[PDB]
């Protein structure tokens, strides 16, 4: 956040330096429990694909 807000960014170098994300899931949670039961009933379900992104975005925020 702070580096992106600087006036004199030197933006190319920071565009390399920004470090990557790891997602963590709570095994006990009704959402993860449900999403797993849904994904086990059909691995290729378009509803679980649409879910995983909606869920993911919320965790960015």
């Amino acid at each position: 956040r702070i580096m992106k807000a600087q006036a004199l960014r030197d933006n190319s170098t920071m565009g390399y330096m920004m470090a990557k994300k790891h997602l963590e899931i709570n095994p006990d949670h009704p959402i993860v429990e449900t999403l797993r039961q849904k994904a086990e009933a059909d691995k290729n379900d378009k509803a679980v694909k649409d879910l995983v992104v909606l869920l993911f975005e919320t965790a960015l925020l």
Partner: protein
């Protein structure tokens, strides 16, 4: 073989091009919005602009029509003179007349300071209820008019309200008092 130990621990920057507050005109601050500060701050911005005018006049530098707008009020206790600024003019009658084409003498700006000091004290235009354009032009140019003391605030103590009343009396006068005005307001704080 060559792969590991990637992390490179580079330098970080703390140099800031600090934003400057777009200052309010006193019109913006007083009428056009009615943003409120305690009266000691109002006397402080009078002192601050009186120092600016004092430092200015020492260099024979005259801008005609010194006003409450061409001054800017910024973040902190911070008030500072500018140039951006029919239209709302304030004038000594010598400037109004055709008579002398360079009415350049410092006394005009001192009396125009006295007008903006009464704006600071009234928070509303001088002559705001009294006149339309014909009367406010003619009677002032003829030397035959004064703004009312009714709008001048009675939360001011005797020291500064009397000094402001002398800033009305200066219309009758030729006195370039600025360093002594500055002394007077400063000491009365």
């Amino acid at each position: 073989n060559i792969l590991l130990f990637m992390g490179y621990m580079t330098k970080d920057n703390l140099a800031i091009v600090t934003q400057w507050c777009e200052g309010s005109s006193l019109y913006k601050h007083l009428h056009v919005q009615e943003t409120k500060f305690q009266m000691f701050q109002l006397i402080d911005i009078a002192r601050q602009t009186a120092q600016g005018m004092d430092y200015l006049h020492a260099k024979n530098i005259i801008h005609r029509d010194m006003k409450s707008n061409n001054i800017f009020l910024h973040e902190g206790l911070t008030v500072k003179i500018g140039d951006f600024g029919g239209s709302v003019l304030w004038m000594a009658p010598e400037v109004i007349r055709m008579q002398d084409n360079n009415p350049f003498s410092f006394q005009s700006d001192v009396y125009s300071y006295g007008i903006v000091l009464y704006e600071l004290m009234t928070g509303e235009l001088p002559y705001s209820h009294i006149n339309n354009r014909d009367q406010i032009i003619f009677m002032v140019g003829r030397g035959y008019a004064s703004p009312d003391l009714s709008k001048l605030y009675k939360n001011c103590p005797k020291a500064m309200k009397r000094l402001v009343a002398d800033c009305v009396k200066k219309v009758k006068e030729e006195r370039p008092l600025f360093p002594q005005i500055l002394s007077s307001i400063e000491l009365l704080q």
